[PDB]
Design a protein around this ligand. Structure first.
Ligand SMILES: Nc1nc2c(ncn2[C@@H]2O[C@H](COP(=O)(O)OP(N)(=O)O)[C@@H](O)[C@H]2O)c(=O)[nH]1
Ligand SMILES: [Mg+2]
Length: 225
């Protein structure tokens, strides 16, 4: 099983009328932080090394895990004094990774993915994204892929009916990004438009929630009792 980088350094929730102070991955989900439930699932999947890539309120998150760590996997921390963006965060985490490939997950997402099958599907690529097929994709960003599942573009939310959720979970070869010329950048907005290698989606019907979406918060609290 690959090393996992969890991106958890962004600000609190930002909705049209509501702004949060707590980091989104630390929202309480029926007695445990959302992040803890993600980490527990990863440990169940065989993950032995988790890197938490932090910035906003990094000391709050670390202090929480020092006191109550839900897993026995190794847990490393990397603190960004100034937010490096999602892409800069990944580039920065490459320092810690000795292997040629690793997993990136957004800390505000919880997906009951089969990571062994995801790794197998990624063997012939340097970048693979997890796409989640749902009957109603309206509240999610989605993926525009062709009939070989090559990713053509990322689509903004606001689309009724079926679609493939842009999960933000990737398997990548660190060589594609470790030496990206900028230290601060967005993975989706700066890196992906430039990347010229093979980029396909692993598409499954896995359970998916994004804790930044209010309806998914209620779904999560109900799911975990
Ligand atoms: N370490 C780090 N993480 C970040 C940064 N920006 C965002 N993140 C994290 O990366 C994930 C995705 O962030 P973002 O794409 O901005 O959020 P979204 N999917 O648009 O709501 C979140 O879990 C967030 O905490 C950053 O500058 N540094
Ligand atoms: Mg969000």
């Amino acid at each position: 099983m690959y090393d996992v980088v969890i991106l958890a350094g962004g600000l609190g929730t930002r909705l049209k009328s509501v702004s949060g102070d707590i980091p989104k991955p630390m929202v309480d989900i029926s007695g445990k932080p959302f992040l803890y439930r993600l980490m527990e699932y990863l440990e169940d999947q065989g993950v032995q090394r988790i890197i938490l890539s932090l910035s906003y309120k990094a000391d709050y998150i670390i202090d929480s895990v020092i006191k109550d760590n839900p897993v026995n996997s190794k847990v490393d921390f990397i603190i960004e004094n100034e937010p490096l963006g999602t892409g800069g965060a990944i580039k920065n985490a490459c320092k810690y990774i000795e292997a040629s490939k690793f997993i990136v997950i957004n800390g505000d997402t919880y997906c009951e993915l089969d990571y062994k099958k995801f790794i197998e599907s990624s063997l012939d690529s340097d970048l693979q994204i997890s796409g989640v097929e749902v009957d109603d994709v309206c509240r999610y960003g989605s993926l525009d892929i062709d009939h070989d599942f090559h990713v053509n573009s990322i689509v903004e939310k606001g689309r009724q009916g079926t679609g493939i959720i842009n999960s933000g979970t990737y398997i990548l070869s660190k060589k594609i990004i470790e030496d990206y010329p900028h230290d601060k950048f967005s993975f989706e907005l700066d890196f992906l438009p430039k990347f010229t290698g093979v980029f396909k989606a692993f598409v499954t019907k896995a359970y998916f929630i994004d804790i930044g979406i209010p309806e998914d918060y209620y779904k999560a609290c109900e799911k975990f009792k």
